Design a binder for this molecule. Structure first.
Ligand SMILES: [Zn+2]
Ligand SMILES: [Zn+2]
Lengths: 70, 171
């Protein structure tokens, strides 16, 4: 019978989610809340809030630190 | 429009060398955050202009103000070539930042098998185990490659005889 009704894939792990399961859209690209990982904190970001800068993604907090004084 | 800084990354590798020839040696100023020209250059990808800089006297064992060694940024860029000559200068892979992130952790975080090999090709050991075991083996066992897993485990891990010499030998 076969099956594999996969569709839509992580924009970072390339996984394939059923996307009302655990897929996260940010801007228009899909990321697993597993792809929601701080490059410093790339442990998954709590409550899922993330901010992307210069090819690396940091919670805003760290992003400002690289992007601005402290 | 960051003047020379913006025009420099315009790919005009000639424009960055142009101001880098400061006959007064001052324009070699980093940024308010302490970002060094080498730092920005490391992620740019113009191996030429940066290569010469490293020869001027800039050391690779430098930590950005946020705490980030060029080794990380280098692999976090994706330029196989720069990595080889950048990681073969001092091999400071055995020198992580403050979180412990090893160049390999980042190398696989993006997807660079080749460079990842040259890293453990020294002894970094791919089975290091970050702070919670967050090592490429897991990030590689997720996609389900199995290709680099066998090559990784075929180095000395899958066929591991029962270790001993530390339980029943004395008391
Ligand atoms: Zn994913
Ligand atoms: Zn963060």
């Amino acid at each position: 019978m076969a099956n594999a009704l996969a569709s839509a894939t992580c924009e970072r792990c390339k996984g394939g989610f059923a996307p009302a399961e655990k897929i996260v859209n940010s801007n228009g690209e899909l990321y697993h809340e597993q792809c929601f990982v701080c490059a410093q904190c790339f442990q998954q970001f709590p409550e899922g809030l993330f901010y992307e800068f210069e090819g690396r993604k940091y919670c805003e907090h760290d992003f400002q630190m690289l992007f601005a004084p402290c | 429009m960051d003047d020379i800084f913006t025009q420099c990354r315009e790919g005009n590798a000639v424009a960055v060398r142009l101001w880098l020839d400061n006959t007064e040696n001052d324009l070699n100023q980093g940024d308010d955050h302490g970002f060094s020209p080498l730092h920005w250059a490391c992620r740019e990808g113009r191996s030429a202009v940066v290569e010469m800089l490293i020869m001027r006297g800039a050391r690779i064992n430098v930590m950005n103000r946020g705490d980030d060694t060029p080794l990380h940024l280098a692999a976090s860029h994706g330029h196989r070539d720069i990595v080889q000559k950048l990681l073969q200068y001092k091999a400071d892979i055995n020198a992580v930042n403050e979180h412990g992130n090893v160049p390999l952790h980042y190398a696989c975080f993006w997807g660079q098998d080749q460079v990842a090999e040259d890293l453990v090709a020294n002894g970094a050991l791919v089975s290091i185990c970050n702070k919670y075991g967050e090592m490429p083996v897991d990030k590689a066992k997720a996609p389900l490659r199995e290709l680099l897993r066998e090559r990784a485990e075929k180095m000395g891990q899958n066929l591991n005889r029962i270790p001993y010499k530390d339980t029943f030998w004395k008391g």
